[PDB]
């Protein structure tokens, strides 16, 4: 499913991401925009052979099992395919684990390069939340 901006904000808010570990909702929406363009079914393969899945492009080396990433750790305890659902629950639950990890949102390269230090509140402007 491809979310609308305000639709995704609302879903993220419901699932407890607004200010999770100090990161305002705009940060999460901005990350989703540039990671996947709000498309739950996005996948991208990396040169190391791992793959990134879903709206937040969560990586198979560490976080989910795709059956083809040798020495994957599956720290979120889920098949990677679960991350492509139109229900964002699994993505959100796993993102919460990732962002608690030490590096915070710098784990998402597009957040670091495209959202960090910007007016991220613009991403929720106009929405009913
Ligand atoms: Cl919930
Ligand atoms: Cl929940
Ligand atoms: Cl949802
Ligand atoms: Cl929902
Ligand atoms: Cl959730
Ligand atoms: Pt939901
Ligand atoms: Pt939830």
UniProtKB/Swiss-Prot annotation:
UniProt keyword annotation of Secreted present: yes
EC number: 3.2.1.17
InterPro entries xref list: Glyco_hydro_22 (IPR001916), Glyco_hydro_22_CS (IPR019799), Glyco_hydro_22_lys (IPR000974), Lysozyme-like_dom_sf (IPR023346)
Catalytic activity of the protein: Hydrolysis of (1->4)-beta-linkages between N-acetylmuramic acid and N-acetyl-D-glucosamine residues in a peptidoglycan and between N-acetyl-D-glucosamine residues in chitodextrins
Other known facts: Lysozyme C is capable of both hydrolysis and transglycosylation; it also shows a slight esterase activity. It acts rapidly on both peptide-substituted and unsubstituted peptidoglycan, and slowly on chitin oligosaccharides.
Subunit structure: Monomer.
Protein name per the record: Lysozyme C
Organism of provenance: Gallus gallus
Lineage of the organism: Eukaryota, Metazoa, Chordata, Craniata, Vertebrata
Gene from which the chain derives: LYZ
